[PDB]
From Swiss-Prot, chain A:
Keywords: Cytoplasm, Developmental protein, Differentiation, Flowering. It holds the Pfam family PBP. This is Protein CENTRORADIALIS. The keyword Protein biosynthesis does not apply. The gene is CEN.
UniProtKB/Swiss-Prot annotation, chain B:
Coiled coil: none annotated. GO terms for biological process: cell differentiation; flower development; negative regulation of flower development; vegetative to reproductive phase transition of meristem. GO terms for cellular component: cytoplasm; nucleus. This is Protein CENTRORADIALIS. InterPro entries: PEBP, PEBP-like_sf, PEBP_euk, Phosphatidylethanolamine-bd_CS. Keywords: Cytoplasm, Developmental protein, Differentiation, Flowering. PANTHER family: PHOSPHATIDYLETHANOLAMINE-BINDING PROTEIN (PTHR11362), PROTEIN CENTRORADIALIS-LIKE (PTHR11362:SF48). Belongs to the phosphatidylethanolamine-binding protein family. It comes from Antirrhinum majus (Garden snapdragon). May form homodimers in solution. Changing residue 24 to Q: In strain: cv. Snowman.
Amino acid sequence: GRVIGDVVDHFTSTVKMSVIYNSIKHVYNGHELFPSAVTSTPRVEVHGGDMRSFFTLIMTDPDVPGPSDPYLREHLHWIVTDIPGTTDSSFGKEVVSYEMPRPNIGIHRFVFLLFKQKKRGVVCRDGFNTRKFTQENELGLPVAAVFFNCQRET
Amino acid sequence: VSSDPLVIGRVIGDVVDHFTSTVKMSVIYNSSIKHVYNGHELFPSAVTSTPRVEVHGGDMRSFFTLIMTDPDVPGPSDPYLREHLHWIVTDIPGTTDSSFGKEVVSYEMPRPNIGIHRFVFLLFKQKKRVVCRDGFNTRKFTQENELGLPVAAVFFNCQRE
């Protein structure tokens, strides 16, 4: 939360989640991954949540086209809705298809954020705003989040 | 006909169908003044300001729309995000220039990620008087707004410094 206060307001994590890429690789906060390792869609395991609970997952890059002068923030990479508590992203509905990381300038944060929905059951990727999208869809503050660093291949 | 730079550079093919130009236009930057010449390269630092597009034909009672787009994103060898839209100006009167029209999508400066990219400017004649920039498609947008085929076009090449 402390690293991503330009993207979302401070919050207290109430649910645990893991991001697994495919030879399997797990995401650890703040670690760097090469572009070639994240070309496929990952699986996001959602470890908590009550009996009839449902969650939305957003993947965004706030450092565009580079972190020193981010004048196109944010660029949206993925949106999945209606994931049941204690399951994973494959069980939800794909709203915005995954787009593989391909950072232009410098080292970018690729951030995964989870929100609790008010019930079970177009979007431009350029200039996306996480605060405004969650306000408009009544998604509240994050219940979990994790990120990795990534830069271009030489 | 052979040696049309729009055919050789594949603007006709990747972006729009074949067309025969009926109006002349000139794209002028002043970020020294730099005139845009088909297929010539400009550095990113020379194109940070909005340019002036001079519309030389038509008449004052006909209006024209201008679209600026990049079909080589994120790089020309595998352009899986094309096209990226940079600018849209509507209602430009014949014989005047882009400053006299109305801004629909604001100018975004070129900042190409991988390799060398084409930055293309196309002009259409209007019949009659939002838009996500990612995954834009010039054929579809012109069909939906009944803009017909281009009446003129020009492009420059640009890469990261």
